[PDB]
A paper describes a structure:
The Cullin 5 (CUL5) Ring E3 ligase uses adaptors Elongins B and C (ELOB/C) to bind different SOCS-box-containing substrate receptors, determining the substrate specificity of the ligase. The 18-member ankyrin and SOCS box (ASB) family is the largest substrate receptor family. Here we report cryo-EM data for the substrate, creatine kinase (CKB) bound to ASB9-ELOB/C, and for full-length CUL5 bound to the RING protein, RBX2, which binds various E2s. ASB9 and CUL5 behave as rigid rods, connected through a hinge provided by ELOB/C transmitting long-range allosteric crosstalk from the substrate through CUL5 to the RBX2 flexible linker.
We first determined a 4.1 Å structure of the substrate–receptor complex containing CKB, ASB9, ELOB, and ELOC. CKB binds as a dimer to the N-terminal ankyrin repeat of ASB9 as previously predicted from HDX-MS data, kinetic data, and modeling. The structure of ASB9 residues 25–34 was resolved to reveal a partial fold of a helix and a turn inside the active site of one monomer of the CKB dimer. The partial helix positions D32 in the active site of one CKB monomer, consistent with previous biophysical experiments demonstrating the critical role of this residue in the interaction. The cryo-EM density revealed an unexpected structuring of ASB9 residues 25–34, which form a partial helix in the active site of one subunit of the CKB dimer positioning Asp 32, a residue previously identified as critical for binding affinity. ASB9 residues 13–24 exchanged over 90% in both the absence and presence of CKB whereas residues 25–31 showed significant protection upon CKB binding consistent with the structure formation observed by cryo-EM. These data suggest that the structure of ASB9 residues 25–34 may position D32 in the CKB active site leading to the higher affinity binding of ASB9 1–252 as compared to the weaker binding of ASB9 35–252. Peptides corresponding to ASB9 residues 25–31, 25–42, 43–52, 50–59, 64–84, 85–99, and 100–107 all showed statistically significant decreases in exchange upon association with CKB, demonstrating that at least two ankyrin repeats of ASB9 engage in the CKB binding interaction. Peptides corresponding to ASB9 residues 176–214, 218–237, 238–248, 249–258, 249–261, 262–289, and 284–291 all showed decreased exchange in the presence of ELOB/C.
Numbering used by the authors:
A (entry chain A): 6 to 323, 333 to 381
B (entry chain C): 25 to 294
C (entry chain E): 2 to 106
D (entry chain D): 18 to 46, 59 to 86, 89 to 112
E (entry chain B): 6 to 320, 333 to 379
Write the structure that this text describes.
């Protein structure tokens, strides 16, 4: 395309000025790498510039170190490996090029967490994303490609049984009353407004072929063609982490089966696990967490220090959303185990703090 | 934007947050004219104002405040616009925010503007906070006092400023006075200041140790402590007593005392 | 040790002593400056003539009173022939008014 | 002992060795300090003893009133103390 | 190329649902046309999915429409003329592709313009824009030539003399002090915020190689690589459009010849005049406007149609010529000047309690 004209200029003329930028890509991409990599492309249509587009478009933040790049398809992880290996390694804490990643949604490996104390655990939630092999990712796919994915999802979702039975809504033509119902339950989403998303082009043609499906019990939610291909969220008020994890697993187990019956499968390989858009969601792409009533620990001086070692993320709300801080190098259910462990520790931490007791004896050297 | 999208924090910025953190004033105005309200917040209750304060973008906070931004809004980490301004150091924003009602004192003890400025070396912001109405000797658990913190980070500019303002030279963290802190950090420069402002060389820390006992005898400080082991001069005592009659930052009134300029300077340069 | 200030009219003297020492020795402490013998001296506390045979401790003086921070006050009169001089001591000058800037709010 | 004279005519008998606290007095070696009022000269003397007593041994705080702080400062300046 | 991959799908799958749109593009592009041109492309690689992306992304206002099409370069107007021609025809109120358009940079043709009533004319300006033949238009340019263009523009602008002498403000290193000054004078141009612009991709790499050049007397602005390659703005307070225009015409001519001294020239052809990214602005691309204090007439119910009759826009009002193509540059500002004079007297009628009647134009 217009890249042919790019090839008429010296690499340094094309080389973007990342001086004011602060992200993982920015530290990784050098003039030397740019000069080399700009000559390569994927069979799907990617070129270095699109890989680093969002990056150069957004310096990001002086404190929040975003990734600064985005993948295009499965092949692009190999084609632009010379950046991804440095970016992935840095973003995921030393994840090496030969560090085999595993997978495991078998609920039998989750110990305890049958009932977290409901005095603290307001609610539990599990979230992930999957991409369908054979298609490209949202930053690149055409209208036709996007539409095909929608249809596949609609078919599979229409066949889920039991509690996984539900209804599909077509975002582009859903009724305002329906919008009211789904916005109240926060199942309704809308066009991306962050410049960190818009720079990728994921909003192209919106709302064409964007879709919402949820089950009858409002515990199983999936979004179609949004931030990534299939966005899956399982949730339930209460502290029953064990059951929610299982529900989630059976959701993906049946959906994968249904796709396999049509010769489709999720993008996956032994090295990066599940293949998604941004680098931060490689491997498991699994997030899990809870809403905990911690008015006490939220004021304690070492709260963030404890969470740091527990490898948990601290987030507010639209009381804390405590969640899995890792994505790659851990066996899915293993990460859920980490969340259960940390939360129970925090509950006890809070118990002692509530009673005015020293809490130093509950601060393990977790790394 | 408008709801718990249950996505990553990276996906929740408004265009205003982006404009705010990088100083895109006209863009900000344009977004406002489209209808992006200034009180739109994200995940941790972070407003454009909070980001603008971190960036130090004075004109942006003027605009945001002009349109009703919450000058005392509190984030999930207990941060306020004022606190954030102190973090960046923006002297102008600190003044402005205070003029619009920013409380010098924070609700949470995890984020004191004064203590932050003390650690950063933001002397003129310390000045403004105190002058506006800030407790220069506020003791806050893990951080002790502003003075103590300045000493911990070797912020001699703030140390001198605070002590002249009237910081309690002998009040640090727990039993660890600022003087003990200097001994631990081996600073002859800060030692000289603290001694001159009335630091107690015989005070004991939690371990029952005097500042001189917290530093190796081979150091210059050992000699410096020896110089002040005996009783202080009468003039020293007088100066200390005189200074006690003035409040925080009120010692400028010393210039009105009926006495020789030499002594006036002696008192003013405490 | 006893830090004692002794005064007469407009004279003042500062001297140290032992709690176990008596007024009699103290009389000779005065003698060293006065150049008049103990019998011509009248040491007194407040308005109470001091007893040569009592110790400073016995007379109510101690480390908690007669300090280096601020000594005790004993007066001195003399034996005017068959009597002794008025037991009066002239106070030092009064204090100046405290300046408004140092005055408390 | 050395007799010091205040501006108001008071006579202070001070052990010479304590008097030597003052740099000015050391330079002067009876002394008439017509420059210093009785209101504070006695105070200075007390200080001389205070400093001597605690030169080599804890040290208590020297007492001082705001009514004398200013004049005393000046006197101390004069006496090199 | 992914273009070839898209061609593996039937046109039916790739055709966008334009029934949700109210812009001109949506009323021109048929699925048949789409199928016909889908496999076509320019020498730059620009395709249909690029030319209508904006029109697709932004549904458009239910009453006020736009075009929604964005060119890639001059050539793309020819390559996809089967789409653009019907768009242009409707956009400018009737215009056949054979109707050769005129150009006119000689102020001498303007009769008047140096004598408007300063009690109503507060200020006036002239805006237009150019692009350099040989480079792609912003929506599809890379950083390389964006920088090459900047280099040329700045170099040439630095050689201007007299009241055209000035200086350049590179946005990437422009200070807050400078920022404040440029904001005060409405010179500063920040990042685009409209979906109609954002959808073109023109906001990428912001603000790499973007900046402002202006003269010492604060009458000429050249926005470099902003909404087009060269945005030329000329302005001055008071009712002396003519001089503004003479500076504009001759200043513009000078910078044009300076590019020509370096073997560069502005995109220009007999049927579209000068070339810009948005179809509505093809032609002269000349927008002269004026701030008119107008308290009485502004409340009169026929004010709207009067401007219509005069070919003026109702943007104190900012009145400007409503056309960009259909007649020459001088003709255009002549209409602006005449309109202002007419409008002044119209208000005067109302001020004196008189009716408008015979002041109504055609």
């Amino acid at each position: 395309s217009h890249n042919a004209l790019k090839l008429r200029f010296p690499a340094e003329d094309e080389f973007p000025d990342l001086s004011a930028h602060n992200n993982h890509m920015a530290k990784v991409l050098t003039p030397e790498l740019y000069a080399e990599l700009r000559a390569k492309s994927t069979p799907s249509g990617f070129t270095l510039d699109d890989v680093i587009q969002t990056g150069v478009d957004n310096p990001g933040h002086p404190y929040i170190m975003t990734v600064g790049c985005v993948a295009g398809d499965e092949e692009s992880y190999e084609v632009f490996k010379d950046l991804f290996d440095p970016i992935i390694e840095d973003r995921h804490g030393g994840y090496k090029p030969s560090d085999e990643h595993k997978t495991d949604l078998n609920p039998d490996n989750l110990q305890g967490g049958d009932d977290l104390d409901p005095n603290y655990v307001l609610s539990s939630r599990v979230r992930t994303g999957r991409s369908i092999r054979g298609f490209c990712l949202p930053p690149h796919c055409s209208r036709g490609e996007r539409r095909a994915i929608e249809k596949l999802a609609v078919e599979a979702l229409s066949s889920l049984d039991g509690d996984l039975a539900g209804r599909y809504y077509a975002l582009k033509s859903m009724t305002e009353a329906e919008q009211q119902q789904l916005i109240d339950d926060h199942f309704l989403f809308d066009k991306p407004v962050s410049p960190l998303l818009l720079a990728s082009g994921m909003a192209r043609d919106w709302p064409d072929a964007r879709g919402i499906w949820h089950n009858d019990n409002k515990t199983f939610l999936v979004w179609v063609n949004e931030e990534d291909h299939l966005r899956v969220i399982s949730m339930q008020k209460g502290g029953n982490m064990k059951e929610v994890f299982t529900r989630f697993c059976t959701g993906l187990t049946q959906i994968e089966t249904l796709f396999k019956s049509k010769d489709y499968e999720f993008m996956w390989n032994p090295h990066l696990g599940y293949i998604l858009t941004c680098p931060s969601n490689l491997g498991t792409g699994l997030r899990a967490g809870v809403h905990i009533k911690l008015p006490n620990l939220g004021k304690h001086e070492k709260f963030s220090e404890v969470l740091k070692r527990l490898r948990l993320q601290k987030r507010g709300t639209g009381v804390f959303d405590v969640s899995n801080a890792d994505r790659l190098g851990f066996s899915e259910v293993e990460l859920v185990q980490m969340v259960v462990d940390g939360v129970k520790l925090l509950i006890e931490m809070e118990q002692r703090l509530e009673q005015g007791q020293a809490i130093d004896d509950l601060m393990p050297a977790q790394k | 934007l408008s709801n718990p999208l249950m996505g990553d924090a990276v996906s929740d910025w408004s265009p205003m947050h982006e404009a705010a953190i990088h100083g895109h004033q006209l863009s900000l105005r344009n977004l406002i004219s489209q209808g992006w309200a200034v009180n739109i917040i994200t995940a941790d209750h972070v407003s454009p104002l909070h980001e603008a304060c971190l960036g130090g973008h004075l004109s942006c906070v003027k605009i945001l405040l002009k349109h009703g931004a919450q000058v005392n809004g509190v984030t999930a980490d207990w941060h306020t616009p004022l606190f954030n301004a102190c973090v960046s150091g923006s002297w102008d924003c600190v003044n402005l925010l205070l003029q619009h009602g920013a409380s010098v004192q924070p609700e949470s003890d995890l984020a004191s503007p004064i203590h932050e400025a003390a650690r950063r070396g933001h002397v003129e912001c310390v000045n403004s906070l105190i002058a506006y109405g800030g407790n220069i000797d506020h003791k806050i658990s893990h951080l002790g006092t502003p003075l103590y913190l300045a000493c911990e980070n070797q912020q001699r500019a703030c140390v001198k400023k605070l002590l002249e303002s009237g910081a309690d030279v002998n009040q640090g963290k727990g039993q660890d006075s600022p003087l003990h802190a200097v001994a631990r950090t081996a600073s002859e420069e800060l030692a000289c200041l603290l001694m001159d402002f009335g630091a107690d060389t015989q005070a004991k820390n939690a371990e029952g140790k005097r500042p001189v006992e917290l530093v190796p005898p081979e150091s210059p400080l050992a000699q410096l402590f020896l110089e002040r082991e005996g009783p202080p001069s009468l003039m020293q005592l007088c100066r200390l007593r005189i200074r006690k009659c003035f409040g925080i930052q009120q010692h400028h009134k010393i210039t009105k005392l009926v006495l020789p300029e030499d002594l006036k300077q002696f008192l003013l340069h405490l | 040790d006893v830090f004692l200030m002794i005064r007469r009219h407009k004279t003042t003297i500062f001297t140290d002593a032992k709690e176990s020492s008596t007024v009699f020795e103290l009389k000779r402490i005065v003698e060293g400056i006065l150049k008049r013998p103990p019998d011509e001296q009248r040491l007194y506390k407040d308005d109470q003539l001091l007893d040569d045979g009592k110790t400073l401790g016995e007379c109510g003086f101690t480390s908690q009173t007669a300090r280096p921070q601020a000594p005790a006050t004993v007066g001195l009169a003399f034996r005017a022939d068959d009597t002794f001089e008025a037991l009066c001591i002239e106070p030092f000058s009064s204090p100046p008014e405290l300046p408004d800037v140092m005055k408390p709010q | 002992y050395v007799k010091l004279i205040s501006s108001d005519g008071h006579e202070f008998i001070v052990k010479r060795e304590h008097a030597l606290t003052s740099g000015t007095i050391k330079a002067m070696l009876e002394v008439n300090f017509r420059e210093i009022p009785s209101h504070v000269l006695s105070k200075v003397c007390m200080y001389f003893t205070y400093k001597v007593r605690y030169t080599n041994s804890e040290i208590p705080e020297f007492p001082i009133a705001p009514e004398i702080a200013l004049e005393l400062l000046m006197a101390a300046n004069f006496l090199d103390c």
